[PDB]
Ligand binder design. Structure first.
Ligand SMILES: CSC[C@H]1O[C@@H](n2cnc3c(N)ncnc32)[C@H](O)[C@@H]1O
Length: 211
């Protein structure tokens, strides 16, 4: 029934309503709930330097209500890791590759927490990337994400030493996109497909190469 929608420059004309709704939800969740104060904005829209023409949003929709989601950004452009947290990837280096996209802003609205949505969101990043031929995603994450990744069968490669970011233990890592990982998650969520791609086809790897 309800699906995760892939929204990009090529199809956002079908989702302008939904995108604005998600920017406000990101403000409710990341700013007002999680107290990530560096992201507070007076328009009540949580929008940073990595929300631009090249961002891809994977948003969980129930009708037109956004109930969860995350975003992907090409590492061929300056990224959150390269610009804000390069010290977290000092051992292995910050990713920079059309085949590696930076994954951030994972959220689930309160009404949908501790339910089916979470594992669908995990499946969605794997499904979208495999479809696009993206090999890895990169992430800056709090260390409590590690068992969550492992629980979803995500293959994780740390890029550097964990460090305190504000008052929270944080690390940089890549996640390997795997058909095998996805197949198990499809079985677990009980759906052959979780990602809906309406409007024109997106060629993410090509776009990243242009950057
Ligand atoms: C990504 S781990 C969470 C931490 O990263 C910070 N963060 C997330 N996005 C950005 C950004 N675009 N610029 C600076 N800090 C960020 C948040 O304020 C939080 O402290």
């Amino acid at each position: 029934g309800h699906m995760i929608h892939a929204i990009s420059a090529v199809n956002r004309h079908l989702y302008e309503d939904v995108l604005e709704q998600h920017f406000r939800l990101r403000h409710d969740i990341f700013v007002e709930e999680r107290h990530w104060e560096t992201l507070r904005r007076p328009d009540g829209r949580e929008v940073d330097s990595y929300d631009d023409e090249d961002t891809v949003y994977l948003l969980a929709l129930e009708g037109r209500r956004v109930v969860g989601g995350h975003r992907l950004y090409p590492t061929t452009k300056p990224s959150m890791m390269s610009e804000v947290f390069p010290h977290l990837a000092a051992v292995r280096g910050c990713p920079s590759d059309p085949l590696i996209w930076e994954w951030s802003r994972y959220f689930v609205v309160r009404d949908r927490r501790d339910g089916a949505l979470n594992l669908q969101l995990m499946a969605a990043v794997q499904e979208f990337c495999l479809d696009q031929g993206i090999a890895q995603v990169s992430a800056i994450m709090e260390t409590w994400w590690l068992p969550r990744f492992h629980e979803a069968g995500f293959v994780v490669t740390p890029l550097g030493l964990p460090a305190l970011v504000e008052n929270a233990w944080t690390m940089a890592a890549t996640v390997d996109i795997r058909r095998q990982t996805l197949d198990v998650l499809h079985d677990r969520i009980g759906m052959p497909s979780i990602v809906q791609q309406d409007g024109p086809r997106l060629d993410a790897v090509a776009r990243a190469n242009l950057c």
